[PDB]
From Swiss-Prot:
Assembly and oligomerization: Homotrimer. Component of a SCF(SKP2)-like complex containing CUL1, SKP1, TRIM21 and SKP2. Interacts with CALR, CUL1, FBXW11, HSPA5, IKBKB, IRF3, SKP1 and VCP. Interacts with SKP2; the interaction with SKP2 does not depend on an intact F-box domain. Interacts (via N-terminus and C-terminus) with DCP2 (via N-terminus and C-terminus). Interacts (via C-terminus) with IRF8 (via C-terminus). Interacts with ULK1, BECN1 and with ATG8 family members, including GABARAP, GABARAPL1, GABARAPL2 and MAP1LC3C/LC3C. Interacts with TRIM21 and SQSTM1/sequestosome 1. Interacts with IRF3.
Subcellular location: Cytoplasm; Cytoplasmic vesicle, Autophagosome; Nucleus; Cytoplasm, P-body
Domain (B30.2/SPRY) ranges: 8-185
Organism of origin: Mus musculus
Function per UniProt: E3 ubiquitin-protein ligase whose activity is dependent on E2 enzymes, UBE2D1, UBE2D2, UBE2E1 and UBE2E2. Forms a ubiquitin ligase complex in cooperation with the E2 UBE2D2 that is used not only for the ubiquitination of USP4 and IKBKB but also for its self-ubiquitination. Component of cullin-RING-based SCF (SKP1-CUL1-F-box protein) E3 ubiquitin-protein ligase complexes such as SCF(SKP2)-like complexes. A TRIM21-containing SCF(SKP2)-like complex is shown to mediate ubiquitination of CDKN1B ('Thr-187' phosphorylated-form), thereby promoting its degradation by the proteasome.
Gene this chain is encoded by: Trim21
Domain comment (free text): The coiled-coil is necessary for the cytoplasmic localization. The RING-type zinc finger is necessary for ubiquitination and for the IRF3-driven interferon beta promoter activity. Interacts with SKP2 and CUL1 in a RING finger-independent manner. The RING-type zinc finger is necessary for ubiquitination of NMI.
Induction info: Up-regulated by IFN.
Transmembrane segments: none
PTM annotation, UniProt: Autoubiquitinated; does not lead to its proteasomal degradation. Deubiquitinated by USP4; leading to its stabilization. Autoubiquitinated.
Protein name: E3 ubiquitin-protein ligase TRIM21
Family: Belongs to the TRIM/RBCC family.
Length: 185
């Protein structure tokens, strides 16, 4: 792909984070803490899952960023509407305002309803995410495998401003403590 020149500097929005997340001083890394991180509750925080949003809101144009997922066993990545549900249980789907892929139990899947199996021969250590607002496209790229395409959502009905979306996943296994990191331009 040739999307690198649409690179945007994403930072994480602390106020949206699940109360167990630890976001770095530079707001570029996030991992699961082993306890509540001593913050007040608010209506923005994701309550049920270890999720956080980017601070940036996109309503036009082409945007590209990269995320490091080295040594994680589970995570979700993509974009979502600014008005997605924060509290309680929900599935990641375009009907609920999410355009995402994930790793879970040694398989990669796109967050369609129902979910779609991905075909990845080289497990990625870094993921590239491309959004074309006007075209209604969200695409995912395998940076470890020379930028190969992972998945394209097309005919997207965003129906609102978009925010970068992250889930570091639970760490029940003791093998999923590693952070998500926003990679430099
Ligand atoms: C305290 C702790 C435990 C496990 C992992 C980390 C972490 O930041 N990952 C390593 C890295 O910086 O690449 C921190």
């Amino acid at each position: 792909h040739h999307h690198h020149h649409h690179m945007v500097h994403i930072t994480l929005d602390r106020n949206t984070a699940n109360s167990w997340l630890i976001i770095s001083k530079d707001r570029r890394q996030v991992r699961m803490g082993d306890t509540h991180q001593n913050v007040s509750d608010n209506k923005e925080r994701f309550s049920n899952y270890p999720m956080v949003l980017g601070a940036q809101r996109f309503s036009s144009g082409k945007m590209y960023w990269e995320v490091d997922v080295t040594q994680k066993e589970a995570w979700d990545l993509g974009v979502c509407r600014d008005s997605v549900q924060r509290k309680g249980q929900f599935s990641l789907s375009p009907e609920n305002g999410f355009w995402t892929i994930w790793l879970w139990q040694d398989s990669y899947e796109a967050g369609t309803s129902p979910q779609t199996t991905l075909h990845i021969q080289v497990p990625p250590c870094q993921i590239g995410i491309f959004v074309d607002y006007e075209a209604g496209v969200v695409s995912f790229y395998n940076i470890t495998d020379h930028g190969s395409l992972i998945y394209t959502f097309s005919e997207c009905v965003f129906a609102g401003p978009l925010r970068p979306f992250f889930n570091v996943g639970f760490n029940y296994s003791g093998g999923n403590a590693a952070p998500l990191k926003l990679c430099p331009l």
